[PDB]
Design a protein around this ligand. Structure first.
Ligand SMILES: *[C@@H]1O[C@H](CO)[C@@H](O[C@@H]2O[C@H](CO)[C@@H](O[C@@H]3O[C@H](CO[C@H]4O[C@H](CO)[C@@H](O)[C@H](O)[C@@H]4O)[C@@H](O)[C@H](O[C@H]4O[C@H](CO)[C@@H](O)[C@H](O)[C@@H]4O)[C@@H]3O)[C@H](O)[C@H]2NC(C)=O)[C@H](O)[C@H]1NC(C)=O
Lengths: 188, 127
């Protein structure tokens, strides 16, 4: 019972290419509470609405989260015309999704910052990430890029963005609706 | 939801004191109940917390194995048996509720940031 969002509140969130995926079945959730624990800067959805995704019953709910600087919002909007959707993280198009950009407030003291934001700028002929999967280069690219420009090959090149005062993160949600299995519901 | 502390007062240097927190108004059964304190001029400190899918508890590390958060089986009132009380333990002790249960260990580490319902506090002074 009650969906277990606790693991997000403790630790250093991974970089975008190492996104952490939490799967929820048979549990009631409260997303509005989770988001109230943050300063929410952006909240867009595909094939569902912010209101609907906090108030619907699903067969499973998937929450991805990672460190992501709010200044790279453009790099998400560009979609497959840029490295993030090409090489790091790209949400399903067969299921409704949302992507949320958030700053962790000073008062929520138990989310730990990494040395910087990092992402894969190239990973190869090119090896693009398929919707909902990890980059083939997840093995060789380090948890954090050391210096903007590193070239790992066993060909994966990393980039960096300086750390902000307060950690900025991204949350990706994918819901799946079933038949006779929609038992991830909002609590009332 | 309504929360009220009691049981405080003057404690001997070294003695123990049991505080309570009557809980009304909760409809579901999943939520966080925490215990806090604040000596004046300073910020609220998190102490102990309860989680109600199972009853798991934890305690901030400055009261480890001295303060013991319990909950009544039938009353759903939460207790706080405190032991080895030092003057540094003198504060106004607040009781706090939240709307879900995973919001707990965090607010216990962040002076009640995510807590929703609060009591007026009771006073504990150790000599
Ligand atoms: C799922 O999670 C959401 C997110 O928390 C819940 O929705 C909220 O419920 C909480 C708990 O009651 C509400 O919190 C309280 O906030 C009051 C101030 O309101 C404004 O500020 C809040 C942010 O805190 C905004 O969300 C809101 O829009 C307003 O702008 C406080 O004044 C309250 O405290 C006082 O009253 C209580 C007793 O009621 C005392 O204990 C306190 O000491 C103090 O006197 C209270 O802390 C929150 O406002 C709700 N938000 C919304 C948008 O409605 C859902 O209820 C939850 N669902 C389930 C099923 O649990």
């Amino acid at each position: 019972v009650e969906c277990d969002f606790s693991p997000l509140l403790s630790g250093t969130p991974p970089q975008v290419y190492n996104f952490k995926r939490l799967v929820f079945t048979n549990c009631n959730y409260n997303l509005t509470k989770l988001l109230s624990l943050f300063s929410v800067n952006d909240f867009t959805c595909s094939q569902i609405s912010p209101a609907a995704i906090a108030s619907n019953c699903y067969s499973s709910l998937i929450l991805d989260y990672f460190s992501y600087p709010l200044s790279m919002k453009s790099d998400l909007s560009v979609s497959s015309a840029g490295p993030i959707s090409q090489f790091n993280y790209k949400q399903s198009f067969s299921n409704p999704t949302c992507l949320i950009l958030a700053t962790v407030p000073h008062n929520l003291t138990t989310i730990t910052k990494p040395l910087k934001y990092s992402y894969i700028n190239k990973c190869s002929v090119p090896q693009l990430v398929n919707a909902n999967q990890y980059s083939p280069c997840v093995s060789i690219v380090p948890s954090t890029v050391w210096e903007d420009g590193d070239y790992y090959r066993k060909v994966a090149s990393g980039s960096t963005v300086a750390m902000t005062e307060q950690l900025q993160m991204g949350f990706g949600i994918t819901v799946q609706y079933g038949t006779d299995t929609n038992s991830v519901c909002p609590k009332l | 939801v309504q929360l009220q502390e009691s049981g405080g007062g003057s404690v001997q240097a070294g003695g123990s004191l049991k505080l309570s927190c009557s809980v009304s108004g909760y409809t579901y059964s999943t939520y966080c109940i925490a215990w806090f304190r604040q000596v004046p001029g300073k910020e609220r400190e998190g102490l102990a917390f309860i989680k109600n899918p199972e009853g798991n508890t934890d305690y901030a590390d400055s009261v480890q194995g001295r303060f013991f958060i319990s909950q009544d089986t039938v009353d759903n009132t939460v207790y706080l048996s405190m032991n080895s009380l030092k003057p540094e333990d003198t504060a106004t002790y607040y009781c706090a509720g939240a709307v879900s249960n995973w919001v707990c260990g965090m607010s216990i580490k962040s002076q009640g940031y995510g807590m929703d319902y609060w009591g007026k506090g009771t006073q504990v002074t150790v000599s």
